[PDB]
Amino acid sequence: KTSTLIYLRAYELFLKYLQNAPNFNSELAEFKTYENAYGEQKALLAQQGFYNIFDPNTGRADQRTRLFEYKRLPISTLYDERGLPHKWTIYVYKAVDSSQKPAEIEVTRKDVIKKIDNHYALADLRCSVCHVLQHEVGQLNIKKVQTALKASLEFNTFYAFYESRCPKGGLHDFQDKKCVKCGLFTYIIYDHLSQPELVHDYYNNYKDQYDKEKMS
Amino acid sequence: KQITQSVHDIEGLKQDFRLEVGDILYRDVVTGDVAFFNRQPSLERSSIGVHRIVVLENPKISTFQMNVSACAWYNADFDGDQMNLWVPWSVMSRVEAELLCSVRNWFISTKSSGPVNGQVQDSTVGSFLLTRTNTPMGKNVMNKLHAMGLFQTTQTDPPCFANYSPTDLLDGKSVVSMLLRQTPINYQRAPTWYSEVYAPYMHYNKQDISTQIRNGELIEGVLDKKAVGAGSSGGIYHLISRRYGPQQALKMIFATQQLALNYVRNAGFTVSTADMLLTPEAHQEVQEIINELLLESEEINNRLLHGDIMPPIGLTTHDFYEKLQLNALKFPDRILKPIMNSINPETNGLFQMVATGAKGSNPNMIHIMAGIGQIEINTQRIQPQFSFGRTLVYYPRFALEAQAYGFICNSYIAGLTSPEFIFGEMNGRFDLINKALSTSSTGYANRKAIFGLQS
Amino acid sequence: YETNQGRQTGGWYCFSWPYRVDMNRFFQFYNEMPLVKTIAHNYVIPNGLNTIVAYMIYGGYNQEDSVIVSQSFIDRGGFAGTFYREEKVELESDIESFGKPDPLITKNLKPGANYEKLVDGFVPVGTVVKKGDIIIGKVAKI
Amino acid sequence: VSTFPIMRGSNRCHTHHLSKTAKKEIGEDPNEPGGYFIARGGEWVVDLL
Amino acid sequence: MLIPVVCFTCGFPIGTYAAIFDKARTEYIKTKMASLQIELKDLITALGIPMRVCCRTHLITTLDYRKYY
Amino acid sequence: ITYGPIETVDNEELTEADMLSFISAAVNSTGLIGYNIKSFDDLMDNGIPQ
Amino acid sequence: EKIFQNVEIKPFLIDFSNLFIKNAAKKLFQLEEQLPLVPVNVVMDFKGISRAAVHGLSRVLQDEIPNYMLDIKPGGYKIEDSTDLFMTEQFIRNRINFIPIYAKNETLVFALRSLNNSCEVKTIYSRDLIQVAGPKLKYPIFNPTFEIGFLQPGKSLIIEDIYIKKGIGRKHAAFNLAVKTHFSHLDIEQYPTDKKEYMALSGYKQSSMTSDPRHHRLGLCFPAVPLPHINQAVRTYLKNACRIIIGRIQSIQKIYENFEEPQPELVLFSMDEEKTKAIITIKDETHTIGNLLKTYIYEMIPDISFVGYQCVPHKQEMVLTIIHKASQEDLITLLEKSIQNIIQTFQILEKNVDELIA
Amino acid sequence: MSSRSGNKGIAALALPTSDMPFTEDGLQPDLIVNPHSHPSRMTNGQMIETTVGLANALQGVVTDGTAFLPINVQLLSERLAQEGLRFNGCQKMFNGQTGEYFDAAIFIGPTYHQRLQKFVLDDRYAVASYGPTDALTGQPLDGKRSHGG
Ligand SMILES: [Mg+2]
Ligand SMILES: [Zn+2]
Numbered sequence A: 001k002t003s004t005l006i007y008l009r010a011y012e013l014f015l016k017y018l019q020n021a022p023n024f025n026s027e028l029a030e031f032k033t034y035e036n037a038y039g040e041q042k043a044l045l046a047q048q049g050f051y052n053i054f055d056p057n058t059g060r061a062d063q064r065t066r067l068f069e070y071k072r073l074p075i076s077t078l079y080d081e082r083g084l085p086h087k088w089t090i091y092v093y094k095a096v097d098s099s100q101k102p103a104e105i106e107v108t109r110k111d112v113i114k115k116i117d118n119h120y121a122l123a124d125l126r127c128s129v130c131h132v133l134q135h136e137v138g139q140l141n142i143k144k145v146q147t148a149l150k151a152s153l154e155f156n157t158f159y160a161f162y163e164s165r166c167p168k169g170g171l172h173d174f175q176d177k178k179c180v181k182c183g184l185f186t187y188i189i190y191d192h193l194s195q196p197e198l199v200h201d202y203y204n205n206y207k208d209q210y211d212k213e214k215m216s
Numbered sequence B: 001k002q003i004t005q006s007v008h009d010i011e012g013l014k015q016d017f018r019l020e021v022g023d024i025l026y027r028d029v030v031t032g033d034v035a036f037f038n039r040q041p042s043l044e045r046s047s048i049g050v051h052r053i054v055v056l057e058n059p060k061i062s063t064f065q066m067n068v069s070a071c072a073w074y075n076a077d078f079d080g081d082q083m084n085l086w087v088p089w090s091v092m093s094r095v096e097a098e099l100l101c102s103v104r105n106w107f108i109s110t111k112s113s114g115p116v117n118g119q120v121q122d123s124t125v126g127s128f129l130l131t132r133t134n135t136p137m138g139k140n141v142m143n144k145l146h147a148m149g150l151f152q153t154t155q156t157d158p159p160c161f162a163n164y165s166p167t168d169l170l171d172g173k174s175v176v177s178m179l180l181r182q183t184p185i186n187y188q189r190a191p192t193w194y195s196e197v198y199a200p201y202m203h204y205n206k207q208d209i210s211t212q213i214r215n216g217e218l219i220e221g222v223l224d225k226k227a228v229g230a231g232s233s234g235g236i237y238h239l240i241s242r243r244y245g246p247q248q249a250l251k252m253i254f255a256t257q258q259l260a261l262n263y264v265r266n267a268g269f270t271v272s273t274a275d276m277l278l279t280p281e282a283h284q285e286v287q288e289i290i291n292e293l294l295l296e297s298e299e300i301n302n303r304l305l306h307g308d309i310m311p312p313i314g315l316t317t318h319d320f321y322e323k324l325q326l327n328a329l330k331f332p333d334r335i336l337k338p339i340m341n342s343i344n345p346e347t348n349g350l351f352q353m354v355a356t357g358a359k360g361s362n363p364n365m366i367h368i369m370a371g372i373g374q375i376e377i378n379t380q381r382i383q384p385q386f387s388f389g390r391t392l393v394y395y396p397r398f399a400l401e402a403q404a405y406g407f408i409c410n411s412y413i414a415g416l417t418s419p420e421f422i423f424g425e426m427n428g429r430f431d432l433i434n435k436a437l438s439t440s441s442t443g444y445a446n447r448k449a450i451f452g453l454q455s
Numbered sequence C: 001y002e003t004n005q006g007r008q009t010g011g012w013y014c015f016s017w018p019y020r021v022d023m024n025r026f027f028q029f030y031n032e033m034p035l036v037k038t039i040a041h042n043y044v045i046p047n048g049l050n051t052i053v054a055y056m057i058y059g060g061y062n063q064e065d066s067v068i069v070s071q072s073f074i075d076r077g078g079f080a081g082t083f084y085r086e087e088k089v090e091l092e093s094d095i096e097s098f099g100k101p102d103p104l105i106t107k108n109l110k111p112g113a114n115y116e117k118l119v120d121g122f123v124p125v126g127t128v129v130k131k132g133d134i135i136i137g138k139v140a141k142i
Numbered sequence D: 001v002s003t004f005p006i007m008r009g010s011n012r013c014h015t016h017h018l019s020k021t022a023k024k025e026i027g028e029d030p031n032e033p034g035g036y037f038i039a040r041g042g043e044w045v046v047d048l049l
Numbered sequence E: 001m002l003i004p005v006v007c008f009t010c011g012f013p014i015g016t017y018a019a020i021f022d023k024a025r026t027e028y029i030k031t032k033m034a035s036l037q038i039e040l041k042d043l044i045t046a047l048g049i050p051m052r053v054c055c056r057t058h059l060i061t062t063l064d065y066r067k068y069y
Numbered sequence F: 001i002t003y004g005p006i007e008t009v010d011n012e013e014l015t016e017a018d019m020l021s022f023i024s025a026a027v028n029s030t031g032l033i034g035y036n037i038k039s040f041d042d043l044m045d046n047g048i049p050q
Numbered sequence G: 001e002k003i004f005q006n007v008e009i010k011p012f013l014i015d016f017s018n019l020f021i022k023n024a025a026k027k028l029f030q031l032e033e034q035l036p037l038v039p040v041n042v043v044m045d046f047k048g049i050s051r052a053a054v055h056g057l058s059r060v061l062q063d064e065i066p067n068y069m070l071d072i073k074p075g076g077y078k079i080e081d082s083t084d085l086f087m088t089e090q091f092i093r094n095r096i097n098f099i100p101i102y103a104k105n106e107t108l109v110f111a112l113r114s115l116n117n118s119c120e121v122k123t124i125y126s127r128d129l130i131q132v133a134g135p136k137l138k139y140p141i142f143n144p145t146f147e148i149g150f151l152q153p154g155k156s157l158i159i160e161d162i163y164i165k166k167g168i169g170r171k172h173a174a175f176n177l178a179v180k181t182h183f184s185h186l187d188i189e190q191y192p193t194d195k196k197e198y199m200a201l202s203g204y205k206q207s208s209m210t211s212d213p214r215h216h217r218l219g220l221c222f223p224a225v226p227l228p229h230i231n232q233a234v235r236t237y238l239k240n241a242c243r244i245i246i247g248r249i250q251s252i253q254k255i256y257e258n259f260e261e262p263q264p265e266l267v268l269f270s271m272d273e274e275k276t277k278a279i280i281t282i283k284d285e286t287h288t289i290g291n292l293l294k295t296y297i298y299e300m301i302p303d304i305s306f307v308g309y310q311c312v313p314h315k316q317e318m319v320l321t322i323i324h325k326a327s328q329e330d331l332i333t334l335l336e337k338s339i340q341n342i343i344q345t346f347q348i349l350e351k352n353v354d355e356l357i358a
Numbered sequence H: 001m002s003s004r005s006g007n008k009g010i011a012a013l014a015l016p017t018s019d020m021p022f023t024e025d026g027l028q029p030d031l032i033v034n035p036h037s038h039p040s041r042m043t044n045g046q047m048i049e050t051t052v053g054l055a056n057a058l059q060g061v062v063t064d065g066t067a068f069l070p071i072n073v074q075l076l077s078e079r080l081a082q083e084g085l086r087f088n089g090c091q092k093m094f095n096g097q098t099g100e101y102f103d104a105a106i107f108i109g110p111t112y113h114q115r116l117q118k119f120v121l122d123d124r125y126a127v128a129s130y131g132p133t134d135a136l137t138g139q140p141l142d143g144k145r146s147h148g149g
Helices: A002-018 A024-046 A142-161 A196-202 A204-214 B068-074 B091-099 B124-131 B144-149 B172-180 B236-267 B280-305 B317-328 B333-341 B349-355 B362-369 B418-453 C002-006 C071-075 D020-026 E015-030 E041-047 E053-061 F016-030 F034-047 G019-029 G051-064 G089-097 G227-257 G287-300 G328-356 H044-059 H073-082
Strands: A088-095 A104-107 A120-122 B034-039 B048-052 B083-086 B187-189 B211-214 B217-220 C025-028 C049-055 C066-070 C081-084 D037-039 D042-044 G004-011 G037-046 G066-072 G109-115 G122-125 G129-131 G147-151 G156-168 G179-185 G216-226 G266-270 G276-283 G306-310 G317-324 H010-015 H031-033 H106-114
Touching: A002 A024, A002 D020, A024 D020, A024 E015, A142 A196, A142 A204, A196 A204, B034 B068, B034 B091, B048 B068, B068 B236, B124 B172, B124 B236, B124 B349, B144 B236, B144 G287, B144 G306, B172 B217, B172 B236, B280 B317, B280 B333, B333 B362, B349 B362, C049 E053, C049 H044, C066 C071, C071 H010, E015 E041, E015 E053, E015 G019, E015 G147, E041 E053, E041 G019, E053 H044, E053 H106, G004 G227, G004 G328, G037 G179, G037 G227, G051 G179, G051 G216, G051 G227, G051 G287, G051 G328, G066 G089, G089 G147, G089 G156, G109 G122, G109 G147, G147 G156, G216 G227, G227 G276, G227 G287, G227 G328, G266 G328, G276 G328, G287 G306, G287 G317, G287 G328, G317 G328, H031 H106, H044 H073, H044 H106
Parallel strands: C049 H031, C066 H010
Antiparallel strands: A088 A104, A088 A120, B034 B048, B034 B083, B187 B211, B211 B217, C025 C081, C049 H106, C066 H031, D037 D042, G004 G037, G037 G216, G066 G156, G109 G129, G109 G156, G122 G147, G179 G216, G266 G276, G276 G317, G306 G317
């Protein structure tokens, strides 16, 4: 019978308020806790539990997510044993049936619709520079990759720094001194070999002294 | 009443019993009357056009109903747009409205010289589904009864099916030919369905990747945004307008629209939460691609730690370091490989909408499925605005991780984290601000340009 | 966009609506808690219904963010409610009063108005009023 | 000689501590918190400047 | 203000068992109890409501004006 | 008022739905409206007389 | 052979085995047994009948069959000045319109007179609808457990003229009779849809464009029929659906047989190649009739040049176009024979309904 | 009308219950939402809510879908499958007008939809050739409220 008690008393208190009751301060304060207890009953008729989806592995709330995780990768996934980035532009395909005589074609993106049909399925890509497949990149030796990149980074930074600058100073990147070339395209092509190995070693001291001056 | 030079309401004309010559009668608008249809802001020449009134006798309808392909004239959509409509009553205005301001004159854009209207959304994908070679069930054919049903609502004179038995199968390209025959044109172009970025994955049907129409006979290929899309210069509707006038182009837009829509009334089209869900193997490859990006970013950072960053002449080290990073966190073209591995293109609703040009693009598919990537505001990363060297309270001062500067690693379907959402909201609000600036900024320029040039 | 549209959604706009005389207020009869609720609904009542929606192409009547609605769902009470408007007028001075303007004196009667269905200057409650009808009849120069 | 507008729900409002049922039968919203002003037939909210 | 007399989507008369379902659900809360820790599938099936997505959706989610006023 | 060492607090079972309880506690503390009512009460009490 | 094969009638019943359900039932309604009117799921098997006819029967039973509802006569809801301020006339009218009734008499008129002389919120249930009109209800027409609006303390609600109105569910959904619970074709093989490769497809092995199913299983649910008289109610509903379809088809048949005499429903043009074009325009006609006509004309004239119908949502009409390599009267008699085929099919359906349920 | 993901929509069709498409189990929609509303707006929350609501209606549960709570769409789809539905929420749907099943399985499920308080009956206005005019310029008054313009 809490319904008839809460309603009638609230009216009497309200009527007492308009008549300036002497005890209205205490009588209303006790009714607030009386209504709050009555309020939870109505809140029970409204709310219906807590709920969450349960994880079978851990029988609490399910926290499994497809979110991203960092998982630092080996450096061989980026640069080859010579130090140049991989270009996954060649698409390798494998036949769905062994009876197919070719069973593998390596074609560029444009040639795919010309030469590939439903009888084949895509396989892992190949780098057009170092000819390694994508799923076999682990075969590349990391310590050889790192030492090649450190020479590639050193030579690239050297020539990037000396893109216009000369190790002996004064631009002169046509022929003079050793600013640009010792013949051929040795200053950008980097695969003629032993020309960068000598010239960079010729002015290695210059590279060391300029980097620290910049880093100040 | 010319005899009285006065206007009488219709309740007090019981003694009239007739109208005399010279009287003017103000009669209710009927179907076939011309009406002016206008959306504000009226920015383009097509912003006011004349439509043939179709009075809707249902008293429960109070909206202005228009074909969807007509919205390209007014830049309108049905998200709550209101457009003015006034029916000319003067004979001079009525003669003018149908002869000069009819929407058939705005089919070709004055701005671009190309067509304005075409198939949009439901029909751009509907035209592709109707005209594709193979359905997942098999060859894309229909019996005589369902080929006839494609022409029920076209409002044109239906073709002849007397040569087809009830058990005869009609190709999807067959029925389109019997509609394109009335306005025979020559069209040969690669469809939007065939894309280089998709080709290494998915097996394109050779009868779908070359849309050729000879004298109104669709003899190969699919019909998509390139052929039937709105605003597609050189499309089939642009060619129909050139040979047979813009009015025939509008009729063939509607006839082809009903043909496509009636096909999807049996083929059915949908998008599901699994259409945007990657396989666990592909999701393991998307992470591998992203870790490769973050590895390159950390390789740049390791150069910065050892002082190996030598900026080019004219750029500061910070400017060069930021320039290097923005190149490091660019999604490679191979990010489509995991997406296409998890997609059945014949049945994937999301892919077909994107690949056929109905709606969306490759970034939308990549963002939903693969990853958001770097967040760029004015062609640069998120600036450290929280404090000196801090981008957010969630990241340390002078943090070098790419995530601190807006690089979002998750995809939309995976669910962004709290700081990824904040960076996304910075880009999201920055797009909302640009829109509001665009309306006001162009308003001043448009009015200045009008007055300088109007004379 | 949702933050904008959530605050415009029809629903139980005020639990004390029958005691209020408000203008342009819509009270939606039926409300539902979302099947997939969020924490926000612990503090504000939900506004809307859990509608079975089909993401399909059906006749091309839903292009450009249009919706095809089941007429039966409308008739059963889906998003139905009451829309309220107020008509408040005040006497300028003792020269004005509420009452049916007597047709004998007139001198300013509205052209083509009803002037019927007025009791004591006001239309009785529960009476339908159309465009031409007169409500809260008032006169001056008394 | 003055009156100051009283925000609904404040300690100087007649419904400051009244019971929810009393608010229900007084014509007020039992669940609403208040925080607005009633001036010349309209309800006004003073925002956070 | 109440559970609809019939399901809005399909018109199955869930209002027949709405009054019984309300108190059965309440008693099922009192034995399980911050939203909805329950599963009401057994209670709904016992009332005779079929395995219809619409009817169960509108039965278990429709707000009651008496609970809030 | 030194608290127990942080090596002993058990949080492996703490889920994010549990942190929703902290959010609810914060909302219950603030009241979601209470700041402006309390500011007006402070006005009437201390500010207007001052 | 027989078209409508054996039927499966299974009413929906309250499972009192659940403790909470029984406790609540006896606590508020004092209910210990099944309610007087229960929903019945009727699952039917159809063989040797086109998909158009079965779907037309389903559509008719859904909304195109005449049905009864409880409505309030205008001025019935006493505006008064004591009535509950929350129970508006619109809200209570919507509550009462959708109370399913199995009324065999239209003269019944009910009155709702509920007063809340107490301090609690009193809920008005359907058992409070007392009846003052003509014949006393031997059996109730509605369940007494429906929740009509609640009354605030001291408030009342008086509605004095709640009568039974006749209509079809297409115009107002409060007349909708049968709710769809099943529809499948038994002569089309189905893929295992729980598999990944077939999860995006419907499941049927034949494409809908090239499929012509003749064996169907149709499941419908009727919302309230008397518990002791379930079978007779189902029989009456199905037979009335068949009668309605036959009657509308005969209405078309009259227009057909008036072909020489002028009429704006039917026009005829002999266009170019001996072909005669017949356009049948009928107002306020649904997809059921147009689909039936198209399918059966196509069955009777396989070599037809074109048959098609369109019920555009606006203009609220069914327009059926037939083009055929035949003269006007040959085409007319072919269409008449096709309509006779439709009538024959639905008369056979009614015969099977009488044979089966009983 | 709008969804909680922010997809406004103006209703332009009123199909009777017989013209509405329906699934094999008889479930039919209340709203029909164009699938093209998704790909360019990227409102994946609505689709995920539809999936979870499909699973919830059968279980008779109401799940908490608050932002930033852990979510696995793969596991929610597996939950759908365990509930008797398909891995995706799609179903075999039949066209209501012709009774023909769609070739593709249609994604139908409960989505919370909001009626925005922008009524067409308030917004629509039509005026005749005469009415109130401005005393100064002689032009019609401004807008619907003045009964002309
Ligand atoms: Mg818009
Ligand atoms: Zn239902």
